[PDB]
């Protein structure tokens with residue numbers, strides 16, 4: 001399975017699954033700096049799943065590792081903002097993260113395998 005390009009549609013389909021999860025609701029759009037006027041004091045780099053989908057569809061990811069780093073930033077930002085480990089929105093974040101990690105591992109493995117095959121004889 002040595003298709004170097006296959007990660008992109010695999011990531012589009014996984015973003016579609018994430019958008020169907022009720023747990024994605026708080027993460028589908030950039031945080032509004034009205035309801036949370038301090039947000040930028042805590043969080044240096046906002047990220048959300050619509051920004052990730054747009055960056056992918058623009059042709060602005062070179063690899064599924066870069067997409068993975070942005071998705072993990074959504075979850076670390078939610079960790080940085082939660083008052084406790086017992087919030088609705090942080091709790092939703094940890095379930096969505098488990099689901100994402102379960103599905104992205106094969107995408108990453110297949111991509112890195114494809115790149116090693118492409119360099120086998122270099």
Ligand SMILES: CC(C)NC(=O)N1CCN(C(=O)c2ccco2)[C@@H](C)C1
Nearest residue numbers: 026029030031078081082087089090
């Ligand atoms: C719908 C809109 C785009 N999202 C939004 O307003 N958010 C999502 C990010 N966020 C958290 O991560 C959080 C952790 C604990 C409590 O809140 C809050 C600032 C609320």
